[PDB]
C-alpha cells in the first residue's frame with residue numbers, strides 16, 4: 001500500500017511542472033547517487049550498482065501477480081509480447097509455442113526452467129506507463145521496458161550486449177549478475193544488439209553481484225551482461241531502456257544529405273563539374289597511382305565534406321528528431337490538477353437524460369497542459385504543432401498527429417511553448433486580433449493541450 | 460565526298476590510341492580554339508562562338524536528307540524520339556500526335572511552322588554515333604545529342620536553359636541565336652533544366668549572332684538561349700550535350716551516407732549519445748537562444764563533420780560513377796585495325812557446310828581493344844569488369860554488363876587497363892599461373908575486350 005514508489009508518485013502529483021517531475025523521478029530512481037554526478041561521470045561510461053538497503057523501494061511498479069493477471073485478462077501473445085527462453089548446456093533455446101500465452105502454458109514453461117520476458121509492460125500496466133512517461137521527459141528519448149521472470153537455479157539467456165542504455169530494477173527475489181566492459185573498441189557504445197556469446201568469448205566481469213529487491217544496476221550499450229538465479233529464490237526485474245539510436249552519428253546521418261543539398265543550391269562551387277579525367281587516377285584499380293592529382297582529388301573531397309558543416313540545417317533536424325520523439329513517446333499521465341483544469345476534466349451537466357461547457361475569454365489565464373507534449377515544426381513552408389496526447393501506449397500504433405498553426409498565431413504559440421508553467425492571459429497573447437487569441441487558445445484547449453487557471457465549468 | 464569532317468574521321472582511323480583520337484576530335488571540333496585554353500578559361504564559364512569561315516566543315520555528320528530517310532526507314536516515334544514544336548504567340552506548343560512519325564506527318568508539321576527535334580540521332584545515324592562515341596571518351600561523361608530542324612520565319616521553342624553543357628553545331632542554313640548570362644546566382648551552373656521563360660523574364664543577351672554552316676557555339680548549363688530563322692532559309696543544327704549531374708556535389712551526395720556509416724562503425728566519438736536536453740536550445744523556435752550550449756552544440760557538429768573526410772570511401776564512389784558512365788556510354792566504333800585484330804574480325808573456316816578453325820599463347824601480344832570500354836569495380840566482396848561493348852545506341856536500353864574478375868587475376872587486369880596502347884605478352888601478365896594468364900586473356904578476347912598484335916587466323 002505505502003512504498004517509496006507510492007510516496008514519490010504522490011509527491012509528483014503536487015509538483016506543478018512536468019519538467020520538474022521528470023528530474024525528481026530520475027533523482028528518486030538512482031537515489032542517493034546524485035544525477036549531476038551520474039550524468040557527468042558515469043552515464044555512457046561505467047557500470048553502476050546502487051545498493052538500496054530497502055526491499056520495498058519499487059513496490060507497486062510490477063509483480064509476478066501482475067504478470068499472472070495480465071496473461072489471464074489481456075490478449076498476450078507469444079513472440080509478439082512474451083518470450084519463454086532457456087540457456088542450457090551453453091545454448092540459448094526459444095520455446096515459444098505459437099498463439100496466445102495463457103497462464104497454463106506460461107507457468108508450465110516456467111516450471112520447465114524457462115525464463116519469461118514481457119516485451120511491452122507499459123501497454124498493460126498503468127504504473128509502468130506512468131513511470132516511463134515521466135522519465136522519457138528527461139531523457140529526450142523514448143523510455144521502453146522489458147520484464148524478466150527467471151525460475152530458481154536457472155539462466156534464461158546467453159550473454160549479450162544491448163543497443164540501449166539499461167537500468168535494471170530488481171523487483172523480487174535475488175539474481176547473480178555479471179557485467180563486462182566492452183571487449184573491443186568497436187563494441188564500446190555499440191550501435192546494435194550483439195549476437196549470442198558463449199562463455200569462451202568473455203573475459204573477467206567488471207562487476208559481479210547478487211541484486212536484491214530495491215537495488216538498481218545501470219550499464220551502457222556495449223557492456224556484455226548475463227544473469228542467473230541461485231538456489232531457492234526466483235527473480236523478477238524490470239529493465240528500463242532508453243537512447244536507442246540517439247548518437248551524434250544518427251544526428252549527422254539526417255543532416256548531411258540536407259547539407260549537401262543546401263550547398264549545391266546556395267553555392268556554385270558545389271555545382272562545378274568534376275574533372276574530365278579523374279577516372280584515370282581514382283578508383284580501386286588506381287589505389288597505388290603515383291599521380292599527384294590523386295592526392296589533390298582526395299584532399300579536395302575531404303575539404304568539401306568539412307565545408308558542408310556551414311550548410312547543415314541543425315535546427316530543422318533538431319525539430320525532425322523532436323517530431324520523431326513526439327511520435328515515439330508514451331502519452332502523458334496527467335496530475336489531478338492537470339485533469340481538472342483541462343478539457344479532460346470538464347464536467348458535463350445532465351438533466352432528464354440530456355447534456356447542458358463554457359467558452360474561453362480574453363481574461364482566461366492559460367498555459368500548456370505539460371512541457372513535453374507538443375513541438376512546433378516548420379515543414380514545406382507550413383507550421384505544424386505535433387503532440388503526444390493521442391498517442392497509444394503501444395509503440396507507434398498511432399501515426400504522427402499534428403494540427404496546423406497559422407502564421408498569425410506563430411508568435412503566440414511560441415510564447416506558450418517557451419513560457420510553461422507560467423500563466424498567460426488569452427488577451428495578452430501576441431496574435432494579430434482578439435479573434436486569433438481566442439481561436440488559438442480554444443483550438444489548443446479543445447485538443448487537450450492547454451489548461452486554464454480556474455476550470456471553465458463546475459459540478 | 461570530301462569534307463573536313465570526313466578527313467578528320469579518316470585521320471582518326473589511323474591513330475592507334477582511342478585516347479588520342481578523342482583528344483584530336485575535340486581539337487578539331489573547336490579548331491582553332493586550343494583545347495587547353497578552352498578547358499582552362501571558357502568551359503563552365505563563358506559562352507563562346509567559333510566563326511569557322513567554312514560552310515563545309517561538318518558535311519557528312521547529319522543532313523535533312525538523313526532525317527527524311529530515317530523517318531522512312533526506321534521506327535521513329537513521336538515523343539520518344541521526335542518532337543514537333545512551335546513557339547507562337549508567346550507560347551510553346553507541342554503538336555506531337557501519338558505513334559510513329561512517318562515522313563508525310565513530319566513534313567506536314569514542318570510546313571505548318573513546326574520545328575522538328577530528334578532526341579537520339581545516334582540511335583539512327585552511324586556518323587553521329589561515331590562522333591559521340593569518340594568525344595565521350597575525353598569528357599568522362601555521356602555525350603548526347605539533339606537535332607533541330609526549324610522552318611523559315613519561325614521559332615520552335617521558348618527560351619530556356621539546359622542542365623548540360625551544350626555545343627551547337629550549325630549544319631545547314633542560318634539561325635539567329637540569343638544567349639544570356641545566368642540571370643541570378645542560383646542559375647549559374649544550374650542542376651536541372653529551366654521552365655519555359657517568356658521574353659519578359661529575360662535581359663539583354665551576352666551574345667547575339669547568326670550562325671552559319673560550320674560555326675560552333677558553346678555555352679554552359681544555366682545560360683538561357685533561344686533561336687529563330689529569318690526569311691527564306693531553314694535551319695539545321697546538332698547540339699552535343701554532356702556533363703549532366705557530373706558535379707562535386709553529386710560526388711559528395713553519394714559519399715556522405717557511406718562516410719557517416721564508416722565513422723560510426725570505426726570511431727566511438729560518432730557513437731556517443733546526444734545530450735538529453737538539446738531540444739531546449741536547438742530547433743527553429745530557438746534560433747535566437749542566448750544559451751551557450753547552443754554554441755557548443757554547433758561546434759561539435761562542425762568538428763564531427765570535418766573529421767568525416769577520414770572515413771570517406773572516395774575510391775569506391777569513383778568506381779560507382781565509373782560504372783554508371785560505362786552503362787551510359789555508347790558502344791565503341793572500332794577502327795579497321797581494331798576490328799581485324801579482335802574477335803569481331805576473326806574469320807570462320809567453312810568446309811562442306813560446317814565450321815573448322817587459333818588459341819592465344821603466352822607469346823601472343825595483346826592490349827585492350829580501346830581505352831574507354833572497360834572498368835574494374837569492387838562491389839560487396841567481389842571484383843567485376845564492367846564494359847561497354849554490348850551497350851545499345853539507345854540510352855539504357857541494355858542493363859549494366861560485367862564479368863567477374865577473380866582476385867588472383869586482379870593485378871593482370873589492372874596492368875592491361877593501365878598500360879594501353881602498349882602491347883604486353885600474355886606470358887608477361889602478372890598472374891600466379893600460366894593457366895591464369897591464358898584464361899584471363901581468353902576471357903577478355905572472346906568478349907571483345909582485347910586485340911592481338913597479329914590476327915589469330
Ligand SMILES: O=C(O)c1ccnc(C(=O)O)c1
Nearest residue numbers: 148156157166168226227239
Ligand atoms: O535476466 C537475464 O537473463 C537477462 C538477459 C539479458 N538481458 C537482460 C536485461 O535486462 O537486459 C536480462
Ligand SMILES: O=C(O)c1ccnc(C(=O)O)c1
Nearest residue numbers: 607615616625627685686698
Ligand atoms: O533552336 C532552338 O530553338 C533551340 C531551343 C532550345 N535549345 C536548343 C538547343 O540546341 O539547346 C535549340
Ligand code: NI
Nearest residue numbers: 160161162225
Ligand atoms: Ni540485455
Ligand code: NI
Nearest residue numbers: 619620621684
Ligand atoms: Ni537548349
